[PDB]
Amino acid sequence: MRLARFDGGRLGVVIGDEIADITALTGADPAQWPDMNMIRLIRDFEGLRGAIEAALPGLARIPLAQVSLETPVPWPNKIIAYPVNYHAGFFLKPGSALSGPTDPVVLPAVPGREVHHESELAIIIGKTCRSVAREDWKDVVFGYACLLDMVVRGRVFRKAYDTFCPVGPWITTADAVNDPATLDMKLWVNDDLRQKANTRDLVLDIPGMIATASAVMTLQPGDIIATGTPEGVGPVVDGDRIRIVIDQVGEMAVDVVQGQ
Amino acid sequence: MRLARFDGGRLGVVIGDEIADITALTGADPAQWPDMNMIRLIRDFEGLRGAIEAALPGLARIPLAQVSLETPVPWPNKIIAYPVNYHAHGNQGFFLKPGSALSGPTDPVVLPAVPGREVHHESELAIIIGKTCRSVAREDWKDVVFGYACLLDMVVRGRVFRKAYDTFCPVGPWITTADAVNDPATLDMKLWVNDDLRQKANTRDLVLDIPGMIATASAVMTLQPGDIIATGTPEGVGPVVDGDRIRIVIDQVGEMAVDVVQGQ
Ligand SMILES: [Mn+2]
Numbered sequence: 364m365r366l367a368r369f370d371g372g373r374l375g376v377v378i379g380d381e382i383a384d385i386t387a388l389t390g391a392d393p394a395q396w397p398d399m400n401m402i403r404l405i406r407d408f409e410g411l412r413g414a415i416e417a418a419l420p421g422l423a424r425i426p427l428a429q430v431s432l433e434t435p436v437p438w439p440n441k442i443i444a445y446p447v448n449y450h451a452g453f454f455l456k457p458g459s460a461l462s463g464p465t466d467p468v469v470l471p472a473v474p475g476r477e478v479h480h481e482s483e484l485a486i487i488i489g490k491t492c493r494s495v496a497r498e499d500w501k502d503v504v505f506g507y508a509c510l511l512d513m514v515v516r517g518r519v520f521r522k523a524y525d526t527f528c529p530v531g532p533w534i535t536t537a538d539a540v541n542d543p544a545t546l547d548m549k550l551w552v553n554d555d556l557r558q559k560a561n562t563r564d565l566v567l568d569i570p571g572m573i574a575t576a577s578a579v580m581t582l583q584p585g586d587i588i589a590t591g592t593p594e595g596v597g598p599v600v601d602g603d604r605i606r607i608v609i610d611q612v613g614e615m616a617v618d619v620v621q622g623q
Numbered sequence: 624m625r626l627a628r629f630d631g632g633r634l635g636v637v638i639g640d641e642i643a644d645i646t647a648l649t650g651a652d653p654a655q656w657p658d659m660n661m662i663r664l665i666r667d668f669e670g671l672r673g674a675i676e677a678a679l680p681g682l683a684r685i686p687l688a689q690v691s692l693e694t695p696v697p698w699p700n701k702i703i704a705y706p707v708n709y710h711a712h713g714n715q716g717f718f719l720k721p722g723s724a725l726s727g728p729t730d731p732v733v734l735p736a737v738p739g740r741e742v743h744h745e746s747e748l749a750i751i752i753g754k755t756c757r758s759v760a761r762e763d764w765k766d767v768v769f770g771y772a773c774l775l776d777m778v779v780r781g782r783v784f785r786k787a788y789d790t791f792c793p794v795g796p797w798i799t800t801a802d803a804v805n806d807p808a809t810l811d812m813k814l815w816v817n818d819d820l821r822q823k824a825n826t827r828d829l830v831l832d833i834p835g836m837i838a839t840a841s842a843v844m845t846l847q848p849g850d851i852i853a854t855g856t857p858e859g860v861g862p863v864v865d866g867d868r869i870r871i872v873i874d875q876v877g878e879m880a881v882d883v884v885q886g887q
């Protein structure tokens with residue numbers, strides 16, 4: 364199942380080229396600030412999936428073409444990112460850096476400095492958990508998303524800029540991915556293919572990243588783990604379009620705009 | 624004014640040795656998960672300050688000894704910490720602490736079991752942000768500051784993971800609103816382990832001053848109400864062991880004591 368926020372924090376299920384509105388069904392308030400609707404849906408999902416599946420045929424269906432998809436989790440407890448982590452410790456990204464699949468990456472105006480793209484699989488945590496054993500990893504994974512880990516090349520602050528952590532376009536629930544350790548990932552800048560890899564090539568694997576993170580910190584429903592980027596990290600400029608596709612997880616494209 | 628969470632996310636005003644429950648008048652829901660009640664109170668405070676002042680005479684007052692004070696903001700958008708940042712004579716820029724590290728004034732610091740390694744205390748003034756804001760000019764700093772709390776920036780000495788363990792960011796015991804601190808750049812701060820005074824300083828000795836730390840953080844990131852800025856620690860950083868008690872006092876801001884306990 365593919366869960367998405369759209370048009371001001373409405374919750375939907377993505378079915379083909381359409382999205383069905385589950386806002387009223389789930390009792391989510393899109394005017395809630397801070398918006399924690401998707402984190403509550405994630406915590407309660409094993410109790411609501413059946414209801415969503417049983418009621419879908421009655422729900423309002425809008426074409427994807429007619430809505431503004433947003434970042435699925437806008438105020439996570441934390442964003443944990445693994446540096447490197449592909450065959451040829453973790454750091455934190457601020458929630459404030461999150462942006463959705465229709466928001467531009469805004470470059471800070473740093474002449475003598477480049478902004479690089481990083482294509483990553485995101486893990487969305489589904490359970491409050493500490494010291495998760497490797498063998499138990501699937502119990503605490505809600506699903507997966509595409510993530511761009513944008514960085515000013517040279518310091519925590521150079522990964523911290525607003526728009527430097529695009530996540531989207533939806534969460535694919537964990538049950539809809541056969542084996543997250545065999546996913547093809549690809550990133551284009553315009554028509555140029557810059558990054559291509561398989562999550563089989565992860566150095567510290569998904570169970571290891573969850574076990575490592577949970578040994579230090581209580582994880583929460585909504586937490587994002589950025590699993591790393593392969594080779595082909597390179598620059599973006601005003602007018603570029605970054606495309607990321609992860610097999611079975613999803614696909615998104617964002618514009619790059621120079622900041623004023 | 625001193626704003627507190629207690630007894631599972633109830634909101635209170637601290638009056639001398641008592642607290643008054645303001646949960647109903649603020650429309651807070653203590654059962655809400657995630658608990659964002661103090662963030663909403665902070666965003667709306669200039670509209671609700673009058674309402675709280677007017678009600679105080681009518682509200683029942685519980686002795687502080689009879690409640691459990693909690694961390695005032697349990698799920699901030701971010702925690703921004705400035706490394707070092709005191710003159711000894713009275714780094715990679717700011718870093719981020721996970722919200723998961725937050726602890727209250729009645730919670731113990733739990734030492735991870737690291738033979739060969741020590742856990743150190745760091746006494747710091749915390750700034751609580753009051754406004755959604757980006758690229759704040761030094762001269763407008765006062766517009767975006769809600770208030771102040773005491774913060775312990777605990778670390779395994781040697782790496783981000785080293786500042787990230789659960790209970791390695793005690794904050795409390797309440798927020799003191801910015802109008803109740805005449806000048807936050809003149810505050811005396813002390814930290815004790817048991818009867819031993821380890822850290823003594825004044826915020827007049829900050830290398831990057833309060834306005835600088837807000838302009839710096841806000842140039843990179845959109846700040847949110849409830850955001851915590853850890854302003855740095857002076858000299859006297861040192862170890863804590865099972866059975867230690869850490870007391871932090873900051874003049875005009877607050878004081879808290881926590882127990883230290885060896886983890887499983
Ligand atoms: Mn990365």
Ligand SMILES: [Mn+2]
Binds near residue numbers: 704705706707745853
């Ligand atoms: Mn510190």
